[PDB]
Amino acid sequence: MENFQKVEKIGEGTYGVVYKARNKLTGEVVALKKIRPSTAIREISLLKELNHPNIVKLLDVIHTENKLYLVFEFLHQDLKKFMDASALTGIPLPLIKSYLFQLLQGLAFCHSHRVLHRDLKPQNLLINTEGAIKLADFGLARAFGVVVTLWYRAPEILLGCKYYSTAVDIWSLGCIFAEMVTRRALFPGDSEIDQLFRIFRTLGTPDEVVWPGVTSMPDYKPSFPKWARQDFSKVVPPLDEDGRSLLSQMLHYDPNKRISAKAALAHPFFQDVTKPVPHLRL
Numbered sequence: 468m469e470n471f472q473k474v475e476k477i478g479e480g481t482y483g484v485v486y487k488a489r490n491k492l493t494g495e496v497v498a499l500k501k502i503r504p505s506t507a508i509r510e511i512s513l514l515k516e517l518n519h520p521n522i523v524k525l526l527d528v529i530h531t532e533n534k535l536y537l538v539f540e541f542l543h544q545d546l547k548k549f550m551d552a553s554a555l556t557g558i559p560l561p562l563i564k565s566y567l568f569q570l571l572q573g574l575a576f577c578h579s580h581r582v583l584h585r586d587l588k589p590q591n592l593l594i595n596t597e598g599a600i601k602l603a604d605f606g607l608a609r610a611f612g613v614v615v616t617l618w619y620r621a622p623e624i625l626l627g628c629k630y631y632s633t634a635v636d637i638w639s640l641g642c643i644f645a646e647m648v649t650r651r652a653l654f655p656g657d658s659e660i661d662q663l664f665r666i667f668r669t670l671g672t673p674d675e676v677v678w679p680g681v682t683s684m685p686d687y688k689p690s691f692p693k694w695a696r697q698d699f700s701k702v703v704p705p706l707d708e709d710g711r712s713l714l715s716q717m718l719h720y721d722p723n724k725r726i727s728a729k730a731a732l733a734h735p736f737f738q739d740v741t742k743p744v745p746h747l748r749l
């Protein structure tokens with residue numbers, strides 16, 4: 468490339484190929500994302516202003532030769548791989564707590580600036596050797612619009628609501644929290660209806676009592692089976708009651724009842740939070 472030198476392909480992201488690259492002028496290593504609209508350019512450019520320790524920095528937006536690239540700060544591992552690498556022993560609770568706390572700070576920051584992610588998943592949660600965890604790709608979904616993982620999708624999205632709110636990110640993070648604890652995805656659906664029914668089988672089929680307005684959602688069908696809610700203690704053992712209480716608030720059906728990132732940071736679960744060093748094999 469004219470301005471970068473590719474080191475290697477990292478993988479296929481939501482919007483195009485992602486490469487580990489080196490800036491020719493500075494020598495800095497970055498995550499270069501090729502995007503496969505004028506409104507998009509202006510909107511994404513605004514995201515360069517975001518700066519928070521728990522957000523992967525968007526270093527630049529490059530629009531040349533009628534191609535679009537996003538340059539992001541590079542991190543050495545994502546949470547998906549770290550979880551796989553920690554499958555035999557599990558991620559220590561203090562580290563799970565630290566990561567969840569940091570992720571909520573990242574969400575609280577973005578949300579306060581009116582920026583949603585909409586597609587949080589272990590793949591876009593990046594970690595470094597110092598114990599930090601950061602979220603990548605906030606705001607891209609809105610700017611760009613429309614096999615993809617549905618495992619972390621909020622129910623309102625699965626039910627066809629086309630108006631998103633900050634709550635969709637809290638739902639996704641709750642699912643990730645559960646996965647770090649049990650070492651298994653919470654709702655590993657293989658289709659949109661399977662995803663929805665896995666949620667219903669665990670949390671109970673929603674109704675107008677727990678979710679006012681649910682029966683009027685675009686894809687809601689009166690024919691959905693009626694499953695009873697499972698005992699929460701069976702879903703994420705052996706997470707303690709503070710952890711279970713917080714998780715339940717992040718997984719409320721009604722997005723308006725779902726806890727905010729800001730309020731979650733004050734939950735008793737974080738009374739003893741610390742910042743442990745993870746053991747990363749790079």
Ligand SMILES: Nc1nc(NC2CCCCC2)sc1C(=O)c1ccc2ccccc2c1
Binds near residue numbers: 477487523541542
């Ligand atoms: N900043 C940043 N550093 C990265 N280093 C890699 C971490 C995992 C191990 C190899 C280096 S990956 C990254 C992303 O921002 C990012 C996020 C989601 C992705 C989903 C699918 C494919 C690529 C993706 C890349």
